[model samples]
Target chain A: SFEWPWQYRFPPFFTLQPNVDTRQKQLAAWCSLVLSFCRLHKQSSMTVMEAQESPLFNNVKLQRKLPVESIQIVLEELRKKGNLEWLDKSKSSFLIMWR
Target chain B: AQMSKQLDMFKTNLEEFASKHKQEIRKNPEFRVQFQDMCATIGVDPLASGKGFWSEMLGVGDFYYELGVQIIEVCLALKHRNGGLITLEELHQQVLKGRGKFAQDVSQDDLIRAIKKLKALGTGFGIIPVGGTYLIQSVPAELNMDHTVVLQLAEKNGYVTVSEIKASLKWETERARQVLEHLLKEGLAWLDLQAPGEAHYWLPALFTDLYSQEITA
Candidate 1:
């Protein structure tokens, strides 16, 4: 039932990392998680707020949730990589491309 | 020629002492480093020439010279991919992997002296400290404080965006971009287009650890 790497439960995963090196790895891992989850569920688009409640962003077993700002930062980076496109100017909704 | 003969006797005595204490010198890291330094100070490089009496007797010369050759081979092979920047420890590790059975007990001191001979080529092959460990840069590009800062930042994940630099260094956006552009133009850094909106500049010289982690992920 646990598809995500063990690092997903690591303490720093719950907060935005301050160290540049650790933060880079944290950000890259989150980007991969979002893309893989969207593709597996046959979902193409998602809202920033919807992601807060999604299993992909929240670990119910651990009662841990990814912060709102962290989600926006990770997805916005994905959008920059051309993996997703914002559906509106508000940037709340995004299109995820498995390609 | 009496003085020359006396020097030869001293060299012979030194060889005998080295042999009697080979295991002692080899086993103790601090002692071995000190021994090399003592030898270097007196202009006595046992690893200087393979055919000399000290080298033929002690065999330290061939070991270091062969290591130097292999180091050159590895550096040339990895130059394009790593931008001529490899850490001293990384260089030692890769040389061991490549040398296999031919590899001997090589030390950092040995590598340092071996690299000394390479200075004659004028390619500016040398070592620089990034943080705690040392990085060997084979290119002539002189890294300044800003470049060192960026390289240290990228040492974590192989790349950094303009915004990340601005945020971390407390510099203006344009200031960060300017440094990135300088690194890019100097061939010290490459752009990774994966991050949106902002330019992602990474140092190839610092990306040596990327492949080892990729397969695990």
Candidate 2:
């Protein structure tokens, strides 16, 4: 079983926080979570649709899920952090690599 | 003249007792507490002077001074995580861990004493009495009564919403928002924009066992 960070179970973690500093921290946490989740599962790339179904974006226990738009935002943050990159101009899928 | 001579002899005996048990007073927390009680009963202040009899004989002044430094280090290291607001129990645990094995045992009284000494530096270090415990505030930020109320309310869930604040505190939306926003800016709270009804403000410092427990299932 993959060990999840404590924040993953927090209901508020699923939401994109509004405060600037909070949003930065929240996004950074999401990016780290996504990277760890991918590395643990040996996943290299995934589409936005696939991400929505995965437990990485959906938490059943809390009955909370990160919206696709928020997922895109997190993925974009990963791209900026250089851990991920868009596979094409369409932005439908992304390549995730652990450096 | 006879009474004065007896009083001087009693003072000498008390000093002899303290010097004889100096090691016990320094090493054992309970012993130190009782010793302090004895001093209070006799109207003596062991902590009154760094170069006084206690310091010269027991080195307690140095002990608290060292402990004060360690406490400050712990507070500064955890300031970001707790936003400079931590409970005395948590602070005690952290300080104990940081002190390493075989280190002198410290008590809550010791911690409070060390923190009290820290106040001499004119820093923001202070103790706030909560429900049945004390919270050590290390930051300079001023927490009003409303903020304290919100912190108390968040103790249950590690988070609270504006509506919950309004309902429980009988406060207006603007007042609740103002306090929460202040906490957010102070890094004491996190904002969640996508709750079912209203947003949630989480105090990461107050996370409980249920939320922090590892889920293997």
Candidate 3:
């Protein structure tokens, strides 16, 4: 339940779906899930701009990576939500909200 | 207050952060994991140091020697714990370490003053009456969990090793080196470097000092 159905159907899943709107929602869910789960699980980090090699990246035998560029987009969306922050001003890594 | 609060969030040792980049280095797949011995070939290559070289590097002029010495203390504290502490001692030793090119006018009194200033930051800074050894009042509370996975894994066996930090943290032995170095520098933890890839964080109960004033406390 951490992710929405749109994220469950994230185009990056079956193919590297590049549909802009579809991809945007997918990333938005991921950012939310990452934030929500971190809050629930008391996790305080994400290496940002990298593959989701951790469980946050993989669940239910379905796997996806928040592509580096999309990580920027998705993160920007979360920034609007005030639940995420770039620990470094250069935007290298993220401190996803567990606060 | 904001800066001190910032310290509570994360206090990453620079080398440890770079060491976690090993996989990104390995992203090339063919890129050889730079070996342990090959590290000697690596010096403080100013070119590769990345960002803020001016403020970071000890300035070339004498205008800020005392500040420079303190800067060196911070870097050395983060970079090489025991040796870093020893390096400060050597810098202040009056032989082998040479006259302060950066901290020219500093006196012993200045060193004591610096300690008091550091103590105010509340990341466990102070002078222990234990031996007149000017040391951190306690272990830094801002321990970098690195990642939840790393933190969970570290807690799994109830004890973690340096090698795991190296392999799982995935930077190399360097991250291990820097943290172990900081532990020594802070005198807050001990490193059991039994395995090449593993190091144990033998943290002291003193680590609790910094968090006593937290909301839960």
Candidate 4:
């Protein structure tokens, strides 16, 4: 089973927090959750459209979903962390792997 | 002269009993507490000196000393996550896990005793009682009574809001915000901006259930 973090159920996690410190931690958690979900499902590549539809960005129980913009922000953070590589300049697709 | 003779005799018998049951005292938390109580009743300080009879015979002092070191290791390891504030129950669980299966049993009482030994370092290692349990502060960050009150309030949901603090603590908005902001600055609280009404200040130290799951995973 995919182990969901407590923050996955937290509504605030669907939104990118504004505080500098808070946003850093929030983004870090989102990045981690995304990586874990991908690893569990053996998903090595994803597009923005696919990610938005994936449960990784959508919480049906809480009726909360990360907007496309926030999902892009989280994916960019994953890239910075060396966990993702953009497949195109427009960032339409990305390869996800655990380093 | 008779009373002095009786006291000496009592001390001798107590020492003999302690030595005979030294293994039990060391291995059993309940037994150790009882033995300590007996010593206290008779005005004996088993942990008084490293070279004292109790140390030589039972090594109770060394037990606590070693435990103090382990507790410090656990606190330092999790300082980033908890910001030096941890509930006593969580600390005990972590320390025990770190000690491994072959290690001797430990209790909250033993942990408190070991922490008391740590107080001599003057490094802000101490316990803060909130509700029924205690919060162990490992770093030198000074937390006032207001902080303690806020921590107690956060026990229910692992997070608290300015409105909750104002209504429950009956304090002005400024007072509540100041304390919450101080905790945020100290890294002891995390901010959540998506709450229904107001933002929430989450205390990671009080996220006991989530912590256990996350740490194990």
In terms of lDDT, which candidate is strongest? Answer: 4
Report the Cα interface RMSD of each model, rounded to 1 decimal.
Answer: 13.0, 2.7, 23.0, 3.4
DockQ values, each candidate: 0.04, 0.45, 0.01, 0.25
Between candidates 1 and 4, the one scoring higher on TM-score is 4
Ranking by TM-score: 2, 4, 1, 3
Residue by residue across B19-126, what tens digits does model 2's lDDT show? 778788766888878877888899987777787767666777888888988888877876655577887887887788877788778989999988987898896998
> What CAPRI grade goes to candidate 3?
incorrect
**DockQ-based CAPRI category assigned to the predicted complex of candidate 4:** acceptable
lDDT of 4 by residue, A1-99 (tens): 667776776665676654567678778889989988988888999888989998999888777788888898988888888999999988898999898
- Number of the top-ranking candidate, with DockQ as the measure: 2
| Candidate 2: pairs in clash | none
User: Which residues of candidate 3, in runs, are more than 4 Å off?
Assistant: A1-6, A9-17, A49-51, B1-217
Candidate 2 chain B lowest-lDDT run of ten: B208-217
Candidate 4 wrongly placed segments (more than 4 Å):
A1-29, A59-70, A88-90, A97-99, B1-15, B38-44, B101-103, B210-217
**Candidate 4 TM-score, true structure as reference:** 0.80
TM-score of each: 0.58, 0.80, 0.26, 0.80
Order of candidate numbers by DockQ, starting with the best: 2, 4, 1, 3
Candidate 1: stretches off by over 4 Å: A1-99, B18-31, B41-43, B47-53, B101-103, B168-175, B208-217
Q: Which RMSD does model 2 reach against the true structure?
A: 5.0
Candidate 1, residue B84: Cα displacement in angstroms equals 1.5
Error in Å for residue B120 of model 3: 78
